[PDB]
Write a protein that binds this DNA or RNA. Sequence first.
RNA 1: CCGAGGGUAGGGCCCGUGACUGGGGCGAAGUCGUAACAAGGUAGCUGUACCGGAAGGUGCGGCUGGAU
RNA 2: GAGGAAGAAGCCCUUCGGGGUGUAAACUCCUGAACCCGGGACGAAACCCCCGACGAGGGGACUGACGGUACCGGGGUAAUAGCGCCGGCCAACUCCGUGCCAGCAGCCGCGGUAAUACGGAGGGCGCGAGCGUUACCCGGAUUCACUGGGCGUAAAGGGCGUGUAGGCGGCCUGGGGCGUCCCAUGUGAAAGACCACGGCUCAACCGUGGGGGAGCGUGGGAUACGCUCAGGCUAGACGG
RNA 3: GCUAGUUGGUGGGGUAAUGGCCCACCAAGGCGACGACGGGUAGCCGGUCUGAGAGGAUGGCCGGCCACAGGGGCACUGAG
Lengths: 137, 208, 148, 122, 82, 7, 99
Amino acid sequence: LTDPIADMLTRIRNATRVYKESTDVPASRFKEEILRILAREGFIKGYERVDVDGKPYLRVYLKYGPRRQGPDPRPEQVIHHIRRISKPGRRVYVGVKEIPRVRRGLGIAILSTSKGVLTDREARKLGVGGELICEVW
Amino acid sequence: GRYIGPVCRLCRREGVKLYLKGERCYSPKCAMERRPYPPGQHGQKRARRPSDYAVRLREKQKLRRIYGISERQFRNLFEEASKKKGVTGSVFLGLLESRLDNVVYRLGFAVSRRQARQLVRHGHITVNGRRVDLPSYRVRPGDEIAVAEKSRNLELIRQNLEAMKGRKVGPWLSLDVEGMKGKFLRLPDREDLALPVNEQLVIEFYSR
Amino acid sequence: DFEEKMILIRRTARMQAGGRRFRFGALVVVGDRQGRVGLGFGKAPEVPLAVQKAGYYARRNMVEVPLQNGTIPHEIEVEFGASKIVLKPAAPGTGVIAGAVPRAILELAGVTDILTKELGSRNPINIAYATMEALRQLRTKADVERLR
Amino acid sequence: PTINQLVRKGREKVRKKSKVPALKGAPFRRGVCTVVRTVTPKKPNSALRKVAKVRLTSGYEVTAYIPGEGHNLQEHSVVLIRGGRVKDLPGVRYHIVRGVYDAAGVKDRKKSRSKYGTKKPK
Amino acid sequence: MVKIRLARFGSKHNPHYRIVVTDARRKRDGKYIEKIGYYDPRKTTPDWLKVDVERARYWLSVGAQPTDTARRLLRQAGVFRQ
Amino acid sequence: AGXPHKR
Amino acid sequence: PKKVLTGVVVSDKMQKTVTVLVERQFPHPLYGKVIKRSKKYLAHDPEEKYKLGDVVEIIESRPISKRKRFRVLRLVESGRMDLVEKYLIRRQNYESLSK
RNA sequence: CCGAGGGUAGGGCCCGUGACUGGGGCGAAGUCGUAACAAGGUAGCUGUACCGGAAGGUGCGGCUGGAU
RNA sequence: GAGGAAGAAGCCCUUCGGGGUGUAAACUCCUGAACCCGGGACGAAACCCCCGACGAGGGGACUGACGGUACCGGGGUAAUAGCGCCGGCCAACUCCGUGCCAGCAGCCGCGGUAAUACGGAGGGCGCGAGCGUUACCCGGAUUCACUGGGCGUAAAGGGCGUGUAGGCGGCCUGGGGCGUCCCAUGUGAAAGACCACGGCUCAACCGUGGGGGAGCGUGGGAUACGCUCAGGCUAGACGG
RNA sequence: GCUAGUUGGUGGGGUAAUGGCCCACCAAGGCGACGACGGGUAGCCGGUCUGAGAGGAUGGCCGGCCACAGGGGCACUGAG
Ligand code: SF4
Ligand SMILES: [Mg+2]
Ligand SMILES: [Mg+2]
Ligand SMILES: [Mg+2]
Ligand SMILES: [Mg+2]
Ligand SMILES: [Mg+2]
Ligand SMILES: [Mg+2]
Ligand SMILES: [Mg+2]
Ligand SMILES: [Mg+2]
Ligand SMILES: [Mg+2]
Ligand SMILES: [Mg+2]
Ligand SMILES: [Mg+2]
Ligand SMILES: [Mg+2]
Ligand SMILES: [Mg+2]
Ligand SMILES: [Mg+2]
Ligand SMILES: [Mg+2]
Ligand SMILES: [Mg+2]
Ligand SMILES: [Mg+2]
Ligand SMILES: [Mg+2]
Ligand SMILES: [Mg+2]
Ligand SMILES: [Mg+2]
Ligand SMILES: [Mg+2]
Ligand SMILES: [Mg+2]
Ligand SMILES: [Mg+2]
Ligand SMILES: [Mg+2]
Ligand SMILES: [Mg+2]
Ligand SMILES: [Mg+2]
Ligand SMILES: [Mg+2]
Ligand SMILES: [Mg+2]
Ligand SMILES: [Mg+2]
Ligand SMILES: [Mg+2]
Ligand SMILES: [Mg+2]
Ligand SMILES: [Mg+2]
Ligand SMILES: [Mg+2]
Ligand SMILES: [Mg+2]
Ligand SMILES: [Mg+2]
Ligand SMILES: [Mg+2]
Ligand SMILES: [Mg+2]
Ligand SMILES: [Mg+2]
Ligand SMILES: [Mg+2]
Ligand SMILES: [Mg+2]
Ligand SMILES: [Mg+2]
Ligand SMILES: [Mg+2]
Ligand SMILES: [Mg+2]
Ligand SMILES: [Mg+2]
Ligand SMILES: [Mg+2]
Ligand SMILES: [Mg+2]
Ligand SMILES: [Mg+2]
Ligand SMILES: [Mg+2]
Ligand SMILES: [Mg+2]
Ligand SMILES: [Mg+2]
Ligand SMILES: [Mg+2]
Ligand SMILES: [Mg+2]
Ligand SMILES: [Mg+2]
Ligand SMILES: [Mg+2]
Ligand SMILES: [Mg+2]
Ligand SMILES: [Mg+2]
Ligand SMILES: [Mg+2]
Ligand SMILES: [Mg+2]
Ligand SMILES: [Mg+2]
Ligand SMILES: [Mg+2]
Ligand SMILES: [Mg+2]
Ligand SMILES: [Mg+2]
Ligand SMILES: [Mg+2]
Ligand SMILES: [Mg+2]
Ligand SMILES: [Mg+2]
Ligand SMILES: [Mg+2]
Ligand SMILES: [Mg+2]
Ligand SMILES: [Mg+2]
Ligand SMILES: [Mg+2]
Ligand SMILES: [Mg+2]
Ligand SMILES: [Mg+2]
Ligand SMILES: [Mg+2]
Ligand SMILES: [Mg+2]
Ligand SMILES: [Mg+2]
Ligand SMILES: [Mg+2]
Ligand SMILES: [Mg+2]
Ligand SMILES: [Mg+2]
Ligand SMILES: [Mg+2]
Ligand SMILES: [Mg+2]
Ligand SMILES: [Mg+2]
Ligand SMILES: [Mg+2]
Ligand SMILES: [Mg+2]
Ligand SMILES: [Mg+2]
Ligand SMILES: [Mg+2]
Ligand SMILES: [Mg+2]
Ligand SMILES: [Mg+2]
Ligand SMILES: [Mg+2]
Ligand SMILES: [Mg+2]
Ligand SMILES: [Mg+2]
Ligand SMILES: [Mg+2]
Ligand SMILES: [Mg+2]
Ligand SMILES: [Mg+2]
Ligand SMILES: [Mg+2]
Ligand SMILES: [Mg+2]
Ligand SMILES: [Mg+2]
Ligand SMILES: [Mg+2]
Ligand SMILES: [Mg+2]
């Protein structure tokens, strides 16, 4: 397994599209810092440490919209789109003046700095750039 | 130079009454109120559905033939407004209005821009005291456009200033009929002038 | 009420012994210029009947398009198979910068300033559908906040 | 391709091939006529097109088209040629400019005169 | 020697000089060392002459040589006032 | 080029 | 400031001279990925005190000879023959690249 | 001593050209047959091999992108 | 330039009623490009001499190729228009001639006896002392795809393994600070570009000022991520 | 695949000055898939053209640097 971060986002993206209540991911501190921001920004209900067959996992609780009407009653997504930016193949580092505005404010950009993992708005207000982790809306 | 040709065919093509002559524009001798169909052998045939390109071209030729300005000067003005700040639609109109030969018409010194040009072109005009014989002079706020002293006494200017005692002049302008003076107050807003022209369709013509 | 624009009128043909038996199709977009748009594809043995059905189907299917001062709230990429439409919000002075098919849908939406680009297959039918699904997917800060 | 693959190999700039090689980067090129004959065109056209085989100042010898009705061109005629092919005459890639050197203009033209080297009649 | 002279800019029949420090072997409109002011000989604007005077004295102190008609425009700007 | 040559 | 570099020693086979193999990392100007690039410098070892596998620092200096423009400034590590093998295996792989 | 270059001798690369020769492309209405598309009238394609005016045929093995 | 007929002649189309060029012309009056006369520059104040002190500072004199040019003043004649195009793309249509001819052509295509596609004409469209053509560059071309493409059948997975360099790499803790991020600082000439103002009557052109980046040098800091070093784990992998 | 002044050393010459730049000698080294060697083309830059940008193309006029002065070699004079 080459990218635990790309795995997590993808592990979530597949669960939200079959409308799972939760989905477990292998546990790591850096993943927690990422999920901490998805919960604080409302994309997920939150997460809680668990053990599966004696192994540390992170159970993530997912959010969706209300039951829609019409011929397809599947709720709108709370995570419409979650996508890796920086990757092991090409790492992506932006300065503070280069941080992109995701979806014109309706989305966030998670990115790791030497002050921690921050959202696009947190970095710009705190004034630091860093490795662009992903984008979510 | 300028178009210099028959001018009633312009209105008959554009489907709209453009005021390019003078008094005749208001008489029943107006070709537009007399044969309001395009010139030539086919003008009375039934128009087929125009294309989107046709519609935008027609707007542009409309606005341009209003001012009697050549396509070079017309677009160089258009491109200037594109670069400047704000809405390009208004600014392009404002700069068009800021032309001296248009002011001299808009101040009633002549009954047609085409005649206002010859007024400017023969020098019968001044700006802020100085003679200015350049129809393209961009008039700024505060400039005092007046008739040349050596030309104040001339039948055409009097008869034009006479019939100007009647009419009022736009909010962005000022005029003193007895002293043949005039003042450019400000850059016209979009609503301050109602041309039969959808300026966005002229923007869209160049965005191609 | 709603305003109608005819995007496309084409003549398709089937075959049988004796030759080609034709049929006509009509893309018609409809809208109020205040935030309601509708797309309909009408197919009939003659041109006026097809333009009729097209407007009818068009009013049967509409979209909210949350305008914000004449532009759209956010940029959006939508692909309706091989056809891709880009919608980017623009400043109040810009204008509707689009091909004829999206422009027709955006002007009847009431969009007065926007940036667009057609990518991939520029089939007007599928560009039209791709434009509608894009509008249909536009959300506001209100929609977003209310979801999270 | 992977980003590493692009680091290794990169993208290949597409090159464009001139469709007027005999010109050798010139807008026009002078020559002399060797064969002045007519050629039939390919499907679905039928005609007797007027073609000159021209020996150039650039070392090349090519077949040029002689546009317009009637021409004064024969062997040893000096001729200027321009780019532009005749779609329906395979191998003709150039046109003769009329009204230049020993190629007279078209007699009694009125429309599109500058494209045929004919001066304005009184 | 290093000198202080006029590098004619502007356009034809529209002279506009920059009082400038450059090497005497440099070309007239060439790469100078520092600009110490401009000068409009045709007096077409309220301030057709301008000199730093502080800098014009530095280069003067270290050995720069003005031109004959550059010496004036530094005199007329009071560079020499004792 | 002596003297006769080969070529 | 005289440029200061760091690299291993891949050759001791010269008198008063060792070959120092410096490498550097930078992002690809177009494809962004961080890529490696190395360069050998012929460094001055006048006391002949440096040997293979030594990771050392070299400093820009006035020419000792043609091609010799750096002086060894200080030792850093020692016995990094694991890096030297990487260099030698590569040069060795070149025999399989001819025709 | 070195030395522009001249000279002798022998190599390498490139360009132009050459009796003749090889196929290639293209060219409204030429001559021969009908290989392929339908089970195309021997299912087709195929690598190889051999043969034959020509398409092609046949052998060995493979494929279904083969009908029923 | 303004005026100027239900609207001349000529030429074009017609259903023979009429329609078109067209307020276009004529014509009337107004203006006055050129040209004629007169005046006539900014660019040029220093070197120099004078007093003082061969200085600071005073005051003085000579000098213009462009040029009798610009410009100002007075007079003063209605005074060059051409080029492309009108099948679709693409804005602009009718008549005759021609009959797969002569010819057109950027692509699709036109021409075989009723051609809006050839040639002329009338009309029409577009530009205008220019208008077209050829050549070449970027764009459309997301058609070398970093932004921003693909590979079952459209062009595209290597016949299959093994493996060198290389690229990439699991969970936890700490050291360093290389990448990366932040702040300060040096450099980033002028011109150009950009914004503002101003000078040639405007403009082009030209002058003045403002705003700066990236990259690299230096100094300080941050340590999440990537890197390296050290220590531990068992979920990958290998073994019994 | 390339290399014999080739790569390093010592001594010396030479120059304003470092250096195989040059000579004597000793050592056997130097470079190359991160493209050596070879072939082709090109003066480089500020900038210019285009482009949504990323990029592409270009380097005439103006400014900076380099190179050459019929083709070559050479030194003299000299701050150069
Ligand atoms: S207004 Fe009537 S008269 Fe004046 S120009 Fe237009 S048409 Fe001719
Ligand atoms: Mg960066
Ligand atoms: Mg311009
Ligand atoms: Mg007068
Ligand atoms: Mg454009
Ligand atoms: Mg599609
Ligand atoms: Mg797709
Ligand atoms: Mg395509
Ligand atoms: Mg909504
Ligand atoms: Mg034909
Ligand atoms: Mg010749
Ligand atoms: Mg002859
Ligand atoms: Mg061509
Ligand atoms: Mg023509
Ligand atoms: Mg033609
Ligand atoms: Mg002059
Ligand atoms: Mg010099
Ligand atoms: Mg010898
Ligand atoms: Mg020799
Ligand atoms: Mg020799
Ligand atoms: Mg000799
Ligand atoms: Mg030889
Ligand atoms: Mg042969
Ligand atoms: Mg026969
Ligand atoms: Mg058969
Ligand atoms: Mg058979
Ligand atoms: Mg068979
Ligand atoms: Mg068979
Ligand atoms: Mg076989
Ligand atoms: Mg047999
Ligand atoms: Mg078989
Ligand atoms: Mg098999
Ligand atoms: Mg079967
Ligand atoms: Mg008139
Ligand atoms: Mg009548
Ligand atoms: Mg009439
Ligand atoms: Mg008549
Ligand atoms: Mg009549
Ligand atoms: Mg003077
Ligand atoms: Mg003197
Ligand atoms: Mg005295
Ligand atoms: Mg005179
Ligand atoms: Mg006068
Ligand atoms: Mg007078
Ligand atoms: Mg008079
Ligand atoms: Mg007249
Ligand atoms: Mg044209
Ligand atoms: Mg048609
Ligand atoms: Mg066009
Ligand atoms: Mg048309
Ligand atoms: Mg016949
Ligand atoms: Mg005939
Ligand atoms: Mg044609
Ligand atoms: Mg073309
Ligand atoms: Mg006939
Ligand atoms: Mg006919
Ligand atoms: Mg027919
Ligand atoms: Mg016709
Ligand atoms: Mg045509
Ligand atoms: Mg015709
Ligand atoms: Mg002009
Ligand atoms: Mg031209
Ligand atoms: Mg464009
Ligand atoms: Mg591209
Ligand atoms: Mg191209
Ligand atoms: Mg290509
Ligand atoms: Mg291609
Ligand atoms: Mg890509
Ligand atoms: Mg593709
Ligand atoms: Mg396989
Ligand atoms: Mg093989
Ligand atoms: Mg490995
Ligand atoms: Mg690694
Ligand atoms: Mg890791
Ligand atoms: Mg660091
Ligand atoms: Mg600069
Ligand atoms: Mg600005
Ligand atoms: Mg900058
Ligand atoms: Mg820095
Ligand atoms: Mg530091
Ligand atoms: Mg020595
Ligand atoms: Mg040497
Ligand atoms: Mg020796
Ligand atoms: Mg030896
Ligand atoms: Mg290297
Ligand atoms: Mg060469
Ligand atoms: Mg050259
Ligand atoms: Mg060269
Ligand atoms: Mg592009
Ligand atoms: Mg630009
Ligand atoms: Mg270049
Ligand atoms: Mg140059
Ligand atoms: Mg010159
Ligand atoms: Mg230059
Ligand atoms: Mg030489
Ligand atoms: Mg010579
Ligand atoms: Mg010589
Ligand atoms: Mg020489």
